[PDB]
């Protein structure tokens, strides 16, 4: 979490 990673 905490708003980083996974976009793609």
């Amino acid at each position, epitope marked *: 979490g*905490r*708003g*980083k*990673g*996974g*976009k*793609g």
Partner: antibody
Framework: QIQLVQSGPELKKPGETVKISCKAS????????MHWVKQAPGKGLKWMGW????????TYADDFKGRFAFSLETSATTAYLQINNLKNEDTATYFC????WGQGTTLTVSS | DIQMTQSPSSLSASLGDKVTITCRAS??????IAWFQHKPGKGPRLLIY???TLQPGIPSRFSGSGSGRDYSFSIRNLEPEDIATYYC????????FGGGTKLEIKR
């Protein structure tokens, strides 16, 4: 495919204003916060803050409180960085992004 | 604010070598570290987030490990397209980049 496209390089005089654009596509714009990052010539990356793309609320890092403004045009899925009262120390390349990033916008502050 | 100390600032290694970069935080960041690749003229590329999760499309040669304050990032076998400056980023509380590591590839 995800792409972030920033506006082109800029020359500005001290005291002037610059506004840099960051056009996002390929994903849901309001699902992810947009961060801004500064890279002065020959230095590393420095985080400037982020803007919540759902509320438009910006959060600035300590060194970027005052002359810096994050904004949005959500209908155009575009983020903006405005720098007022430009200083020589603002000469840098600025990046928008989070997981994926724009190509950078080089700003030169000079007379 | 959380400070990040990245080491080494410059790294020389041969093609095919394993290379390792470390970052230490000024306090426990509970695995909220990311690693970026940056080539001049391009935007940063996120390689790894949450210490060890690879982004989609990132080669399996890249990995990360660590916990608490101590983290590492490794390239299993250095390859020419890896030429870049690498940065860690804590995102436990706000954001802080490490100072960066420049690569010198030997061949």
């Amino acid at each position: 495919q995800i792409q972030l496209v920033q506006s082109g390089p800029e020359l500005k005089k001290p005291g002037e204003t610059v506004k840099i654009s960051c056009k996002a596509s390929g994903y849901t714009f309001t699902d992810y916060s947009m961060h801004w990052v500064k890279q002065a010539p020959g230095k590393g990356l420095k985080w400037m803050g982020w803007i919540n793309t759902e509320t438009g609320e910006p959060t600035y890092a300590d060194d970027f409180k005052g002359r810096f403004a994050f904004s949005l045009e959500t209908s155009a899925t575009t983020a903006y960085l405005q720098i007022n009262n430009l200083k020589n120390e603002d000469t840098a390349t600025y990046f928008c992004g989070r997981d994926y990033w724009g190509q950078g916008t080089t700003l030169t502050v000079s007379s | 604010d959380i400070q990040m100390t990245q080491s080494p600032s410059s790294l020389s290694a041969s093609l095919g070598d394993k290379v390792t970069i470390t970052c230490r935080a000024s306090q426990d960041i509970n695995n909220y570290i990311a690693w970026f690749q940056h080539k001049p003229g391009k935007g940063p590329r996120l390689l790894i987030y949450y210490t060890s999760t690879l982004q989609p499309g990132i080669p399996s040669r890249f990995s990360g490990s660590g916990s608490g304050r101590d983290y590492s990032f490794s390239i299993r076998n250095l390859e020419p397209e890896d030429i870049a400056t690498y940065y860690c980023l804590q995102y436990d509380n706000l954001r802080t980049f490490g100072g960066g590591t420049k690569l010198e590839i030997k061949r």
